[PDB]
Design a protein around this ligand. Structure first.
Ligand SMILES: OC[C@@]1(O)CO[C@H](O)[C@@H]1O
Ligand SMILES: [Ca+2]
Length: 287
């Protein structure tokens, strides 16, 4: 009898997406909804299958962390034309007026915070590597732009490789091994996300290069723990749990009386995480 909210994210092997799913589920149930939690594994066909499932089950709203900024438009529009609104988190789509909300972190602002800390830790000089995210996710390019708009003020810092590891810890490990072999004279690595930072720090440790400075982005417990143990030096918190809950709150308001947010596209502030506040961070929230 209870209304159903469908929650669709990428795979839960990245703790960011698991945390979004659990935060969205918690808020939905707190507000009296049943939930259907599905993963699309960054596969647009799987995402389309899951949206079909939400439609067939009669979901009253979809919470979506999407499988590609371009590829996801049609599936969101399919749900819309079936009378089911979507509230997107984390990742934008390249279309307005289709989703009811797109609630994302302020990726450019956050990336600048991380790069400013990276520059400081690097002493404004030295060779570095950059790991970038998936081309299909606009966050990858926004963060890389924020990083370079900071780092291009420091002429003694030089990028000696810039490679995508597709938001994957395992790809980042393998990539980092290759990059390090070709560029032993590196002083730091700046990563577009935390799973790639985890892969990079592990590859560097296996190579006996604990001297290399690594900065990530997301604020996961895994990277927090690395910061606490003297591994990775900093990251940038995206408020994943609160963002997922806010999407459900807006979904509920829309279901109840068609309240819509004044602006579809919404930003949430990021915060730098380093050794001084890592001990206040838990499951993508500071206390
Ligand atoms: O690790 C989570 C992400 O940083 C990677 O994919 C999306 O952009 C997230 O924000
Ligand atoms: Ca600049």
């Amino acid at each position: 009898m209870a209304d159903l909210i469908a929650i669709i994210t990428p795979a839960h092997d990245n703790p960011f997406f698991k945390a979004e799913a659990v935060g969205a589920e918690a808020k939905a149930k707190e507000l009296g909804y049943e939930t259907l939690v599905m993963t699309h594994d960054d596969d647009a066909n799987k995402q389309s299958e899951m949206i079909d499932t939400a439609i067939g089950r009669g979901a009253k709203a979809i919470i979506l962390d999407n499988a590609g900024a371009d590829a996801s438009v049609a599936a969101v529009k399919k749900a819309k034309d079936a009378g089911i609104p979507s509230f997107l988190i984390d990742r934008e789509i390249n279309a307005t007026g289709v989703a009811v909300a797109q609630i994302v972190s302020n990726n450019y602002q956050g990336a600048q915070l991380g790069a400013q800390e990276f520059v400081k830790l690097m002493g404004e000089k030295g060779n570095y590597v950059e790991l970038v995210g998936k081309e299909s996710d606009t966050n990858a390019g926004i963060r890389s732009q924020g990083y370079h708009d900071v780092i291009d003020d420091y002429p003694e810092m030089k990028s000696v490789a810039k490679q995508s590891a597709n938001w994957s810890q395992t790809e980042a490990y393998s990539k980092m091994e290759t990059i390090l072999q070709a560029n032993p004279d590196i002083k730091g690595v700046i990563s577009g996300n935390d799973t790639m930072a985890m892969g990079a720090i592990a590859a560097l440790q296996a190579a006996g290069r604990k001297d290399v400075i690594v900065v990530g982005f997301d604020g996961s417990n895994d990277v927090r723990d690395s910061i606490k143990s003297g591994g990775i030096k900093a990251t940038v918190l995206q408020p994943a749990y609160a963002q997922a809950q806010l999407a459900v709150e807006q979904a509920d308001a829309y279901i109840k009386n068609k309240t819509t947010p004044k602006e579809e596209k919404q930003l949430m502030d990021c915060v730098l995480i380093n050794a001084d506040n890592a001990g206040k961070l838990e499951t993508f929230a500071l206390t």
